[PDB]
Design an enzyme around this catalytic site. Structure first.
Site, PDB file in Angstrom:
ATOM      1  CG  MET A   1      -0.267 -45.664   4.854  1.00 28.97           C
ATOM      2  SD  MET A   1      -1.326 -44.357   5.497  1.00 28.97           S
ATOM      3  CE  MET A   1      -0.365 -42.902   5.105  1.00 28.97           C
ATOM      4  CG  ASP A   2       1.352 -51.554   8.102  1.00 30.66           C
ATOM      5  OD1 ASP A   2       0.817 -51.016   9.096  1.00 30.66           O
ATOM      6  OD2 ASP A   2       2.589 -51.572   7.928  1.00 30.66           O
ATOM      7  CB  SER A   3      -3.148 -53.039  10.330  1.00 34.79           C
ATOM      8  OG  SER A   3      -3.801 -54.061   9.605  1.00 34.79           O
TER       9      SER A   3
ATOM     10  CG  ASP B   1       1.891 -48.221   8.614  1.00 33.13           C
ATOM     11  OD1 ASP B   1       2.170 -48.594   9.771  1.00 33.13           O
ATOM     12  OD2 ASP B   1       2.352 -48.767   7.591  1.00 33.13           O
TER      13      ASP B   1
END
Ligand SMILES: CCCCCCCCCCCCCCCCCC(=O)OC[C@H](COP(=O)([O-])OCC(O)COP(=O)([O-])OC[C@@H](COC(=O)CCCCCCCCCCCCCCCCC)OC(=O)CCCCCCCCCCCCCCCCC)OC(=O)CCCCCCCCCCCCCCCCC
Ligand SMILES: CCCCCCCCCCCCCCCCCC(=O)OC[C@H](COP(=O)(O)OCCN)OC(=O)CCCCCCCCCCCCCCCCC
Ligand SMILES: CCCCCCCCCCCCCCCCCC(=O)OC[C@H](COP(=O)(O)OCCN)OC(=O)CCCCCCCCCCCCCCCCC
Ligand SMILES: CCCCCCCCCCCC(=O)OC[C@H](COP(=O)(O)OCC[N+](C)(C)C)OC(=O)CCCCCCCCCCC
Ligand SMILES: CCCCCCCCCCCC(=O)OC[C@H](COP(=O)(O)OCC[N+](C)(C)C)OC(=O)CCCCCCCCCCC
Ligand code: SF4
Lengths: 118, 119, 506, 105, 136, 60, 155, 49, 80, 93, 149, 137
Positions: free
Chosen positions: J39-41, J43
């Site tokens: 997951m990125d920022s 998500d």
């Protein structure tokens, strides 16, 4: 006569207490105490006149004033009766219930057509 | 935070809770039913009560009011009846007179001023 | 003297500035008023003259030598209670300043003493309802005197609701009596004691049984006593029973004229059931006040057997028991208000939350009192040993005298159960003694400086610094030796109870 | 001794006399027991509820049922509506049967 | 003829002067009401800005029938002096139906009374119930 | 005078990294109130799309 | 057609189904009114008016006063009518059949030439005979004034 | 005693509905004839189980 | 019917609903006294009824005062 | 009181965490967000509020801007779960 | 400068009181007088030729219990609650028309039908317990058990 | 005293209540006749609160509470003066002295609630002023 008037007081506070409008529901807690507080004063004044004639009959009180009108001995009670009478009907200068500048129509800001007239 | 929120006495050390028929841990799996066995007092200042952040009663003294002699939206934040914070929302009569004056000569810009303070 | 001084205290308290010293000084004005009341009462009221029974205030109030005994007792126990709020119970400002935070505390107490002392004297169903409300309303206010406390207010709300239902049952019995006979004065009803439904007087008793916490109604009393501040529980768990049990005794005196057996069976059903709950209930408890709430129910069960039997020996059993039980109750609660100075302080597990309303709340907070203060531990031991019924303490003579009255009237079943119930209850009185002393020899040489008493400032380091205040110590010692050494003057005291009459005469 | 059974006009009411005769007997000094006053106690209860007399009315109602006696000829004439207490019913000489005025006195 | 006190700007000053002693709208049965529930006439007296526009529609919807709307002055009519502004609605008839337009800046008190008199003549010409018998 | 609800001081940040922490923090604050946004504004769509469209404008 | 029965059946129907506190306060007013009206006719007109003056005028509007303070938040037709019908069947409060089926009268007399209202006699006895009952009542009222302020007042 | 006391602890809880219901049940002891006491004594002993 | 304790179904689920049931219960006692007093032509029963109405009012005021302070005790943050 | 358990709450943690598209759909206590889930920022923060919605809990910015391992969240929730406040009428009746 | 247009509503409110009072004073007086003329409708309506001037009877107020006994006593003499008569001897129908009202003494409907007001420790024993009623029934039985002596 | 004339009045007033409600329901023009845009139900815009135009969403002072609470004790004092009114002559001096005593005890309550200033709203939250004091070193 005093009992009948206190039923009307119950009728007034019920108008706002079944409403979610903020202006209409505002004029219940202040409406309730104003009528509650000046009911003691109006009830006691009536009882002082009834004490002077020792009768709780309207006709006997009127006939007891043949030689003198109770405005002469009890002038302060008449001012107190009239002041109290204004509050009980919520008339100005005791107008804070239905104050247009303060709470618009008070409880009647949600009333229209027949409920307004009655 | 946004949605909810959570001593004057000696910190008293109580250790070794025991009754006449045994100790606490011997009946601790049944004490959830016995409400006289609650070790959590409800009057302790450290009692965790997850209470929502109900906003203060916010009346809209909106434009359609005799007091608002123009178009005012007064937002009143009060504790009870005594007013804590008030937030006047002006701009309901913003017509951009200052933007319009720049497109008109000095003689045409004059009537824009009778219409600032009506009285 | 009580009523007149109450008005002066009401007005004066509302004038002077809110402060603890003035609040504590006004509490010492009430201690005088209660003392003055006793001197005026004892002066005019005598056992020799009140023997016949004297009607007062248009026969509304009837006073005799049996009622007069309890009025003086009530006044005495109200002096020993006011000594707590009027002087220091610990001397540590943090714990004590709770007793002085309320200015209407002493006023409400003075309201109740008027309510308590007039209840045994009532002689009219119209004044029975009024007086029982005057006492009942004063208790709810005292329960909620600490209006900031969440548990106290929750208890007064529970107290008001149960008492309101209790008062309605009392009011309904009197109305039903008035419906049958049309008479309000109790003496006039006695003329028709054979012509009225005797069970309507039992419906009256069912209302008075709720107010003394008798099973199956015992549930609320245990909850109330375990939530109010220990200073409040010390009053509301003893005083109502002093004035209601006296009234119940008189109502049962009139009832036994027709000697209806069905009435006695129902009351025996409640006495029997209460002994069971009063004994088996306290076996599994951790809170001390919940323990003394079950202890209170059991003693009320014993005192009802003397009331139910209602003979010449029942007056002696009740009069003696109600006196010794009050002194024992005061002595135990006074100690619990003091030994809170020996509680340890944290520097963890089980997260026990203590408040300034009940600093001593659990039985294991009495641990090692044999070490921290041996003299006061024995005083608590002697007091508990009286409740157990170990002779020759005061408690033994209460049970011994109650048994005489019970068996002399054929209550064999109840006499045996009370002797079973007494032994079952000895288990949870013994736990208090187990916690007091049994772990002495392991803890004998310990490095203790984290006690609450160790936060007291050092004054001079040369003068002797007593740990406990003067007045509370003298009360504890006096009532501990009276409990212990009743054998010395027991014969005079019992012969002083033979004379208390309730229309025995000849 | 306190007043009991006071009428709506401040005087003794219907059953005060019976109650007073009971008090005289109970508080009397020439009586060894309360047996002589037992009849007076019944009269005070009787004066208030008429339970024994209502019972007697029940038998006379029930006895006539088992004999077939016509209720209208053994009972007493009655009128249920106060407006029809007409002068014909009251027995006046030239009385109409038109209703009477019970509106305002 | 109970209007609703919806004065917004300088046009409202002339609206109050109609109720002043000289003209005395009350003598004709005209009482300004502060609530839609008790009002049947909406008088738009002043400039209708973009920010005020949704509120004007909401207040209009809350008036029980039958209802009439009067547009007073040049701002309400068609923008007026502020017709070429970024924050002014060019005519309140873009938001609510308007039954009669009173012209002026501001309309004189008599000009407003002429507008009220004209509307009453129209209300007396209604045939709400004869319509049922004939048109329906 | 006191500021209104949910107000913040206006400070000109001088570090890039400092801003992203504020930017990321603010994002959940939008997300946290999403159900209330629907309830208070009587929106005709479930709160899922409200959370959906908030995220897109940050990336822009 | 003793219509006083129908007023209570409606009242007994709404007492079984009331949910909020608005309806609970309505049951109070809906119970006093049959009590007042059945006292106005039949038994005592004086105590019908005392009830209106003291209950409705004094203690009823206090309930609605605190309900606005407290909060305002948050069965089956077969069982209700079945319960109400079962409740309706047996309405004989007493089992003295003759006392409930046989009528009685009183005989008037002219011995009382000083005729005055009941409230005249009640005052005559309350202010003379039972002046202790009257004085304790003012004492109970006094304790309430102190009692209310200590419970509710903050500081 | 562990069995009996574990039942009695479950009964002491602050609840208006519980205390009100107990009181109204006790009015039955005024209605029933006194010869029915022992059956109420047995019924009570059963609900312990 | 009421021997199955039907009146418990008729009492609402709020503390204020209990307070009302206490008043309606006591109201029955006073009505019973007024009934007897008028039939007997006895004013002593009417003195009792007057006391019951006055005492039943004081009970309401104290109960509501406890309930009112009970309510504000929870809503006692007041840190604004 | 908090009547929650460490094992049971993870089941609520597992199921709600299943609502975001990840490289690995299997979830445990040690499942990370950058590696085990990818997951990125944005998500991650959508997942946090979703877990907040399930647990009646609100993270603080200190924790929420530093979370890498799931077990801390389960540690956070059990250490920060309080009963919802009861109204005056509901408590005693 | 007295405004007459301002006082028009008051002159109409003055007529409002006068309208109600004028009707009540005259209609009630006429009805009371007419029914106090005789015991039949052919007497009440017509006025005889040999009858003198009519003496109206004004409505009565502030009565007491004697006026309820006087009213029925007048009814049995003239057929009206406020009839007039001063004959030293009454009609022979006066001795056989005394009205004695018989009414029941049952508790109010609310006391015995309310879902809540009827529940009480003693009201159940009156309604469901035979203890009281069996005891009293003994006294009723022993009334007829003592007629033999 | 007859009250059959009073009864007809109460019955007529009861009938007058039904007339006031229904006369509106039979004289208003049909919703189709005026504008047809909907009934009061569906037209939720018309069937709503009045908030002066802008859509928005009771911790009352304790002084207001004590005003209402203290109304009840002072009302029972006034209503219990009723028996003395219609019996002032026949109780004489004795009942007059009792009545005055009945009033003195209640007045001591009036003194108590006058000294505490229980009914005053007070301002504990705000209206604060301070002295600017320099702290030189
Ligand atoms: C009262 C009796 C007065 C009187 O009879 O004569 C004047 C009065 C007419 O007043 P007017 O004609 O204006 O006086 C001549 C000038 O116009 C009067 O013009 P003016 O403005 O020069 O009058 C001056 C005078 C005021 O004019 C007056 O004389 C009125 C004084 C009366 C005061 C009490 C009333 O003084 C004042 O202004 C101060 C008076 C107010 C002081 C405070 C009030 C005192 C109380 O005569 C009448 O009674 C008839 C009209 C009254 C109304 C009757 C019809 C009522 C409506 C029914 C339907 C039609
Ligand atoms: C302090 C105790 C004061 C005792 C006063 C008791 C008293 O004076 O009356 C005794 C009373 C007998 O009185 P009576 O029979 O009616 O006739 C004589 C009246 N002149 O006898 C009685 O019947 C009263 C019954 C209650 C007696 C309770 C026993 C007293 C307990 C002593 C407590 C001592 C506490 C230590 C005090 C410490 C002070 C700092
Ligand atoms: C002159 C007539 C005055 C009464 C007009 C209203 C009559 C309607 C019937 C209600 C009165 C019947 C008496 C029993 C009380 C029942 C109250 C109740 O349960 O709620 C009624 C009302 C409408 O709600 P509803 O749909 O019926 O019930 C489910 C709502 N969730 O719920 C509401 O609270 C809405 C507002 C009603 C407020 C009424 C206040 C209580 C009644 C006092 C006035 C009448 C006094 C009682 C007289 C009759 C007694 C039998
Ligand atoms: C006397 C009098 O004038 O009575 C005549 C009456 C009414 O008089 P009014 O002047 O309207 O009374 C009102 C008096 N104020 C001014 C005090 C309100 O009018 C007619 O009957 C015509
Ligand atoms: C007292 C008031 C006196 C003045 C106002 C009278 C106007 C009302 C007449 C009316 O309503 O007439 C019109 C009506 C029906 O037509 P509508 O428009 O649908 O009626 C609206 C009202 N409904 C729909 C409720 C009925 O015709 C009749 O029923 C003819 C008889
Ligand atoms: S039209 Fe003219 S007078 Fe009216 S609001 Fe606009 S600028 Fe003002």
């Amino acid at each position: 006569l005093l009992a009948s008037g206190s039923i009307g007081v119950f009728g007034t506070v019920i108008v706002g207490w079944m409403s979610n409008s903020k202006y209409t529901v505002l004029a219940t807690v202040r409406t309730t105490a104003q009528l509650i507080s000046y009911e003691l004063v109006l009830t006691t004044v009536v009882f002082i006149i009834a004490l002077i004639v020792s009768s709780l009959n309207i006709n006997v009180i009127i006939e007891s004033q043949y030689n003198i009108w109770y405005i002469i001995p009890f002038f302060p009670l008449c001012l107190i009766f009239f002041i109290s009478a204004l509050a009980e009907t919520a008339r100005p200068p005791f107008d804070n219930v239905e104050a247009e500048s303060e709470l618009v129509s008070g409880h009647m800001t949600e009333l229209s057509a027949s409920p307004f007239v009655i | 935070n946004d949605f909810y929120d959570v001593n004057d006495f000696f910190p008293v050390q109580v250790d070794g809770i025991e009754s006449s028929l045994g100790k606490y841990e011997e009946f601790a799996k049944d004490a959830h039913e016995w409400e006289s066995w609650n070790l959590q007092n409800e009057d302790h200042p450290e009692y965790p009560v997850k209470r929502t952040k109900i906003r203060h009663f916010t009346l809209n003294f909106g434009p359609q009011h005799p007091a608002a002699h123009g178009v005012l939206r007064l937002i009143l934040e009060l504790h009870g009846e005594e007013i804590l914070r008030s937030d006047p929302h002006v701009g309901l009569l913003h017509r951009g007179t200052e933007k319009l004056i720049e497109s008109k000569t000095y003689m045409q810009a004059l009537p824009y001023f009778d219409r600032l303070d009506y009285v | 003297m009580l009523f007149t001084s109450l008005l002066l205290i009401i007005v004066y308290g509302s004038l002077v500035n809110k402060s603890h010293l003035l609040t504590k000084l006004i509490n010492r004005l009430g201690l005088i008023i209660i003392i003055y009341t006793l001197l005026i009462h004892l002066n005019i009221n005598t056992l020799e003259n009140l023997s016949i029974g004297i009607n007062m205030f248009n026969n509304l109030l009837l006073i005799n030598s049996f009622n007069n005994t309890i009025i003086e007792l009530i006044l005495i126990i109200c002096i020993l209670y006011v000594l707590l709020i009027s002087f220091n119970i610990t001397g540590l400002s943090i714990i004590d300043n709770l007793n002085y935070s309320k200015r209407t505390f002493i006023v409400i107490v003075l309201f109740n003493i008027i309510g308590l002392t007039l209840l045994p004297l009532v002689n009219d169903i119209m004044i029975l309802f009024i007086i029982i409300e005057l006492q009942s309303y004063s208790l709810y206010l005292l329960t909620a005197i600490f209006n900031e406390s969440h548990n106290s207010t929750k208890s007064a709300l529970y107290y008001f609701i149960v008492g309101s239902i209790a008062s309605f049952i009392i009011l309904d019995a009197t109305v039903s009596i008035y419906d049958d006979l049309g008479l309000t004065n109790i003496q006039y009803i006695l003329m028709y004691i054979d012509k009225l439904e005797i069970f309507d007087l039992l419906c009256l008793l069912f209302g008075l049984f709720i107010k003394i916490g008798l099973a199956p109604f015992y549930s609320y009393s245990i909850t109330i006593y375990s939530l109010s501040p220990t200073i409040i529980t010390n009053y509301i768990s003893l005083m109502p029973k002093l004035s209601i049990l006296t009234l119940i005794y008189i109502i049962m005196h009139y009832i036994n004229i027709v000697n209806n057996t069905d009435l006695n069976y129902v009351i025996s059903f409640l006495i029997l059931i209460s002994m069971f709950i009063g004994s088996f209930g306290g076996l599994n408890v951790i809170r001390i006040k919940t323990l003394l709430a079950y202890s209170s129910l059991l003693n009320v069960s014993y005192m009802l057997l003397a009331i139910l039997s209602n003979s010449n020996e029942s007056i002696i059993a009740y009069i003696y028991y109600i006196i010794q039980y009050s002194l024992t109750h005061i002595n135990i609660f006074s100690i619990i208000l003091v030994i809170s100075i020996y509680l340890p302080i944290m520097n963890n597990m089980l997260n026990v939350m203590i408040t300034k309303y009940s600093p001593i709340e659990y039985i294991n907070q009495l641990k090692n009192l044999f070490i921290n203060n041996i003299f006061i531990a024995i005083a608590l031991c002697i007091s508990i040993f009286s409740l157990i019924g170990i002779p020759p303490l005061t408690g033994f003579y209460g049970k011994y005298l109650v048994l005489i009255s019970g068996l002399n009237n054929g209550y064999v079943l109840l006499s045996i159960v009370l002797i079973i119930a007494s032994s079952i209850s000895t288990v949870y009185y013994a736990t208090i003694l187990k916690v007091l002393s049994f772990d002495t020899l392991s803890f004998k040489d310990i490095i203790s400086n984290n006690l609450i008493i160790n936060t007291s400032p050092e004054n001079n380091n040369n003068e002797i610094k007593p740990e406990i205040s003067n007045v509370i110590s003298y009360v504890i010692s006096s009532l501990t030796l009276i409990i212990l050494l009743i054998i010395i003057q027991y014969e005079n005291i019992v012969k002083g109870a033979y004379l208390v009459l309730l229309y025995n005469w000849v | 001794a306190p007043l009991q059974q006071v009428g709506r006009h401040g005087g003794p009411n219907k059953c005060f006399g019976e109650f007073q005769r009971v008090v005289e007997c109970m508080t009397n000094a020439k009586h060894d027991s309360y047996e002589p006053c037992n009849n007076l106690k019944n009269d005070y209860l009787e004066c208030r509820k008429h339970k024994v007399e209502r019972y007697k009315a029940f038998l006379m109602q029930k006895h006539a049922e088992e004999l077939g006696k016509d209720p209208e000829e053994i009972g007493a004439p009655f009128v249920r509506k106060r407006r029809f207490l007409t002068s014909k019913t009251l027995g006046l000489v030239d009385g109409d049967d038109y209703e009477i005025g019970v509106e305002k006195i | 003829f109970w209007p609703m006190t919806f004065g917004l700007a300088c046009c409202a000053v002339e609206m109050m002067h109609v109720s002043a002693p000289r003209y005395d709208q009350d003598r004709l049965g005209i009482i300004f009401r502060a609530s839609p529930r008790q009002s049947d006439i909406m008088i738009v007296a002043g400039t209708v800005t973009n920010k005020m526009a949704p509120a004007l529609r909401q207040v209009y919807d809350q008036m029980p029938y039958p209802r009439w709307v009067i547009s007073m002055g040049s701002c309400a009519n068609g923008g007026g002096y502020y017709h070429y502004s970024y924050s002014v609605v060019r005519g309140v008839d873009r938001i609510v139906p308007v039954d009669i337009y009173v012209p002026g800046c501001p309309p004189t008190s008599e000009a407003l009374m002429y507008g009220v008199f004209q509307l009453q003549k129209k209300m007396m010409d209604g045939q709400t119930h004869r319509m049922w018998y004939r048109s329906y | 005078t006191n500021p209104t609800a949910f107000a913040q001081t206006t400070r000109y940040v001088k570090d890039s990294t400092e801003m992203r922490t504020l930017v990321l923090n603010l994002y959940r604050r939008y997300l946290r109130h999403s159900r209330g946004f629907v309830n208070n504004y009587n929106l005709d769509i479930p709160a899922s799309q409200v959370r959906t469209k908030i995220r897109q404008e940050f990336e822009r | 057609m003793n219509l006083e029965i129908l007023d209570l059946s409606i009242l007994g129907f709404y007492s079984l189904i009331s949910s909020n506190s608005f309806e609970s306060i309505a049951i109070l007013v809906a119970t006093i009114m049959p009590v007042i009206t059945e006292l106005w006719y039949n038994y005592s007109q004086l105590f019908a008016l005392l009830y209106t003056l003291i209950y409705v005028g004094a203690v009823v509007i206090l309930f609605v006063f605190i309900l606005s303070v407290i909060n305002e938040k948050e069965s089956g037709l077969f069982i209700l009518i079945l319960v109400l019908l079962l409740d309706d069947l047996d309405d004989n409060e007493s089992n003295d059949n003759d006392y409930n089926n046989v009528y009685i009268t009183d005989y008037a007399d002219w011995f009382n030439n000083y005729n005055e209202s009941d409230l005249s006699v009640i005052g005559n006895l309350l202010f003379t005979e039972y002046a202790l009952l009257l004085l304790i009542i003012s004492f109970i009222l006094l304790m309430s004034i102190i009692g209310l302020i200590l419970i509710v007042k903050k500081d | 005693s562990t069995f009996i006391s574990s039942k009695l602890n479950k009964l002491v809880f602050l609840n208006i509905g519980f205390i009100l219901e107990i009181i109204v049940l006790s009015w039955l002891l005024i209605v029933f004839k006194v010869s029915l006491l022992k059956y109420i004594l047995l019924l009570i002993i059963f609900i312990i189980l | 019917m009421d021997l199955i304790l039907l009146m418990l179904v008729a009492v609402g689920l709020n503390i204020i609903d209990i307070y009302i049931m206490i008043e309606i219960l006591i109201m029955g006692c006073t009505v019973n006294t007024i009934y007897s007093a008028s039939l007997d032509n006895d004013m002593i029963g009417l003195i009792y009824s007057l006391i019951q109405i006055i005492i039943a009012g004081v009970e309401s005021a104290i109960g509501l005062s406890i309930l009112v302070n009970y309510n504000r005790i929870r809503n006692s943050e007041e840190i604004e | 009181a908090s009547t929650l358990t460490k094992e049971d709450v993870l089941t609520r943690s597992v199921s709600v965490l299943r609502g975001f598209e990840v490289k690995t759909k299997d979830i445990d206590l040690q499942t990370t967000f950058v590696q085990d889930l990818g997951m990125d920022s944005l998500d991650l923060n959508d997942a946090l509020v979703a877990l907040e919605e399930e647990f009646d809990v609100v993270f603080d910015d200190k924790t929420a801007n530093e979370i890498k391992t799931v077990g801390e969240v389960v540690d956070f929730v059990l250490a920060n779960y309080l009963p919802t406040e009861q109204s005056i009428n509901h408590t005693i009746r | 400068m007295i405004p007459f247009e301002a006082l028009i509503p008051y002159a109409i409110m003055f007529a409002g009181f006068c309208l109600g009072g004028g009707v009540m004073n005259s209609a009630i007086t006429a009805d009371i007088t007419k029914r106090a003329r005789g015991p039949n409708q052919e007497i009440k309506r017509n006025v005889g030729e040999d009858e003198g001037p009519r003496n109206y009877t004004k409505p009565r107020y502030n009565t007491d219990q004697w006026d309820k006994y006087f009213a029925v006593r007048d009814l049995r003499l003239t057929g009206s609650l406020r009839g007039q008569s001063d004959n030293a001897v009454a009609e022979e129908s006066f001795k056989t028309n005394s009205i004695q009202p018989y009414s029941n003494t049952r508790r109010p409907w609310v006391l015995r039908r309310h879902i809540i007001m009827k529940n009480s420790p003693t009201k159940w024993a009156r309604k469901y317990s035979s203890r009281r009623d069996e005891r009293e029934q003994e006294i009723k039985d022993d009334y007829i058990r003592g007629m033999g002596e | 005293m007859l009250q059959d004339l009073f009864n007809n009045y109460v019955i007529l007033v009861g009938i007058l209540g039904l007339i006031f409600l229904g006369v509106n329901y039979f004289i208003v023009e049909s919703p189709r006749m005026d504008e047809n845009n909907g009934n009061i139900s569906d037209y939720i815009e018309k069937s709503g609160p009045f908030e002066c135009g802008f859509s928005s969403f009771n911790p009352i002072p304790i002084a207001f509470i004590l005003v209402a609470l203290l109304f009840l004790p002072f009302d029972l004092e006034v209503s219990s003066m009723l028996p003395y009114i219609v019996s002032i002559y026949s109780v004489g001096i004795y009942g007059l002295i009792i009545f005055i005593l009945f009033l003195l005890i209640l007045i001591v309550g009036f003194i108590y609630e006058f000294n505490t200033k229980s009914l005053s709203i007070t301002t504990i939250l705000h209206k604060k002023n301070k002295a600017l004091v320099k702290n030189l070193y």
